[PDB]
Amino acid sequence: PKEPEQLRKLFIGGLSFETTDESLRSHFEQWGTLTDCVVMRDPNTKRSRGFGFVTYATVEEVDAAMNARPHKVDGRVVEPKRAVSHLTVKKIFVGGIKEDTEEHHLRDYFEQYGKIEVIEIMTDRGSGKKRGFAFVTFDDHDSVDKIVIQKYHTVNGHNCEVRKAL
Ligand SMILES: CCC(=O)Nc1cccc(N)c1C
Ligand SMILES: CCC(=O)Nc1cccc(N)c1C
């Protein structure tokens, strides 16, 4: 039961034009087994396009690589991002939390995806009653990228709808 390959890929932007399949692989093999590693090049000149992708054997390895950012590859800090499900944001909408979900429920759950900077539990402008949804802002986009590819989110017993926000 191998995780889908799309969820094991990291797109690496900002490459040095000197980076090769081999040097990209040598770098990212520090955090797991790479089943694929390619630097994108022009079909005619073979000059690097400045980006490429690596595929790990497992999702846990993708996490390890993301948690080892910043990555300086061949002298240049690169920009790894998980493959598209790129709309790169740090904020999520959390819906379906009803009136009884509080800040600590959302924090205790989502803090295991990344570092939380803001939790905004939405209330009615007129009555102050909870509206049943919230926004969570993290310090970095990978948290959000991990969150929105999950099929399910269970918080405070509620089955929640979670999507990228703005
Ligand atoms: C940093 C060196 C570099 O850009 N390499 C390069 C330049 C022009 C053509 C081709 N094919 C290649 C590999
Ligand atoms: C496996 C990924 C993981 O545990 N989550 C993570 C990664 C990086 C920063 C922070 N704060 C957190 C909670």
Q: Which domains are assigned to the chain?
A: 5-82 (3.30.70.330), 91-164 (3.30.70.330)
Backbone φ/ψ region at 81: left (φ over 0), alpha (ψ -120 to 50), beta: beta
Q: Whose CA is nearest to atom 2 of ligand 2?
A: 63
Place of tokens 């797991």: 32
CB 65 within 8 A of CB 10: yes
Give how far Cα 9 sits from Cα of 20, 28, 43, 113, 141, Å.
Answer: 17, 12, 23, 18, 16
Rounded CA separation 49/74 (Å): 15
Q: Ligand 2: does its nearest atom lie under 6 Å from the Cβ of 67?
A: yes
Place of tokens 């993290």: 138
Record the resolution, in angstroms.
Answer: 1.5
How far, in Å, from the CA of 113 to the mean position of ligand 2? 5
- The contacts of residue 44 (CB under 8 Å, 6+ apart) are none
Coil vs helix vs strand at 11? strand
Rounded CA separation 27/18 (Å): 13
Rounded CA separation 146/155 (Å): 16
Q: What share of the chain is helix, strand, coil (3-state, %, to 5)?
A: 25, 35, 40
Place of tokens 């400045």: 50
96 is written with which tokens? 């379906």
Q: Ligand 1: does its nearest atom lie under 6 Å from the Cβ of 45?
A: yes
